Amino acid sequence: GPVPSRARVYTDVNTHRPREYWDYESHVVEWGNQDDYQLVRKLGRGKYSEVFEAINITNNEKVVVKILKPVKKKKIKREIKILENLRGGPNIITLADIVKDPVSRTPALVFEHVNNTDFKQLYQTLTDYDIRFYMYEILKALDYCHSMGIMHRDVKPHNVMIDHEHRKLRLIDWGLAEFYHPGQEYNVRVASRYFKGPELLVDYQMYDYSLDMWSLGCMLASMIFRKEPFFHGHDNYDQLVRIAKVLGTEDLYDYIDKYNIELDPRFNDILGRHSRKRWERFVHSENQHLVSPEALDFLDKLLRYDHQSRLTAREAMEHPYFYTVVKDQARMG
Numbered sequence: 001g002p003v004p005s006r007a008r009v010y011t012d013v014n015t016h017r018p019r020e021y022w023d024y025e026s027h028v029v030e031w032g033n034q035d036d037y038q039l040v041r042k043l044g045r046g047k048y049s050e051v052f053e054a055i056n057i058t059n060n061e062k063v064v065v066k067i068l069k070p071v072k073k074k075k076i077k078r079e080i081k082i083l084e085n086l087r088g089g090p091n092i093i094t095l096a097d098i099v100k101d102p103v104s105r106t107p108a109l110v111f112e113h114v115n116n117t118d119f120k121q122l123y124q125t126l127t128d129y130d131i132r133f134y135m136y137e138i139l140k141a142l143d144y145c146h147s148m149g150i151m152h153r154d155v156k157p158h159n160v161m162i163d164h165e166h167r168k169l170r171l172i173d174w175g176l177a178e179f180y181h182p183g184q185e186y187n188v189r190v191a192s193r194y195f196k197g198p199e200l201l202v203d204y205q206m207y208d209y210s211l212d213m214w215s216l217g218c219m220l221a222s223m224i225f226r227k228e229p230f231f232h233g234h235d236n237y238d239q240l241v242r243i244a245k246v247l248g249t250e251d252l253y254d255y256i257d258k259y260n261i262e263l264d265p266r267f268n269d270i271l272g273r274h275s276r277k278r279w280e281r282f283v284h285s286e287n288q289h290l291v292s293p294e295a296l297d298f299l300d301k302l303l304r305y306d307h308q309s310r311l312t313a314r315e316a317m318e319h320p321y322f323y324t325v326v327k328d329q330a331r332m333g
């Protein structure tokens with residue numbers, strides 16, 4: 001079988017916490033009163049939800065209400081426990097309440113902050129400075145949730161919200177998130193195709209927080225090269241083929257061997273041999289101003305086949321790519 005793996009950071013954070021922290025199946029949800037919230041208008045639809053602006057008539061504050069499509073009870077409890085555990089963390093959506101429709105019993109999550117713009121509507125026209133600024137903010141969220149023992153597992157541009165007027169960023173959509181426990185095997189169907197890490201594509205189940213760092217690298221490459229998505233696979237196998245045509249097959253086969261992963265031999269016949277490409281292959285007159293030596297060094301260190309070799313969120317925060325932007329002077333407009 002495959003060789004085991006352990007996270008090299010935050011490995012035991014859930015172990016050191018009480019069982020109640022992470023045993024979401026045992027958690028009893030304290031539901032609120034749906035009558036406190038009146039929906040004002042529709043913001044959008046989701047893979048498993050409908051999203052509204054609403055008013056909290058008990059304090060006259062505007063809120064966001066996410067009404068969930070039917071899910072197994074275990075998964076709603078997981079999402080709620082994770083949001084409660086992360087509440088107050090940097091750049092993470094803030095769960096204000098949870099209610100059920102009185103008639104349909106459909107669960108709805110209430111979040112604090114309005115004034116949202118989906119990051120995917122903005123991230124292809126950012127300055128170099130703004131890419132670095134918002135990348136650092138996403139890193140703060142990932143370092144925090146990883147430090148709280150949680151993998152997000154669906155990092156992508158659509159799951160980042162921006163308060164543009166206030167330069168605030170929030171990581172949203174915690175419905176696929178899970179608690180990291182050393183030795184646990186995890187579902188390989190998570191994340192969206194273009195942001196799936198190699199571990200998901202080869203069905204290696206003993207992965208960890210570093211999955212999120214691969215997805216983040218895919219976002220970075222998309223922004224600095226203005227290519228959406230950066231790895232444009234047409235099916236799960238083609239996703240890996242597209243990655244291998246950039247990173248090369250040599251390090252992919254090294255990864256497969258290291259963890260004793262078994263690939264279907266006939267897919268391996270299709271993967272074949274591909275050399276690692278220069279990043280300047282993706283540099284064009286329209287994106288050259290976004291691409292620096294430190295950007296490419298940082299990207300190289302996120303987009304590693306071996307999940308154990310990828311930068312941690314804290315290591316990423318220390319990278320020279322962010323040397324100047326941490327000095328930001330908090331101008332709003």
Ligand SMILES: C=CCOc1cccc2c1-c1c(c3c(n1C(C)C)CCCC3=O)C2=O
Pocket residue numbers: 043044045046047048049051064066093111113116117118161172173174
């Ligand atoms: C104008 C956009 C505001 O949109 C917000 C605002 C706050 C919080 C959330 C969203 C949101 C969420 C989710 C989705 N949107 C959107 C894209 C419709 C799509 C499906 C998955 C999902 O969770 C929020 O949690």
Ligand SMILES: [Cl-]
Pocket residue numbers: 120156157158159
């Ligand atoms: Cl996306």
Ligand SMILES: [Cl-]
Pocket residue numbers: 183184185186
């Ligand atoms: Cl397991």
Ligand SMILES: [Cl-]
Pocket residue numbers: 178185186187
């Ligand atoms: Cl899982």
Ligand SMILES: [Cl-]
Pocket residue numbers: 230231232233242
């Ligand atoms: Cl591609």
Ligand SMILES: [Cl-]
Pocket residue numbers: 009142143146209312313314
């Ligand atoms: Cl991390």
Ligand code: NA
Pocket residue numbers: 061062063111112113114
């Ligand atoms: Na609010």
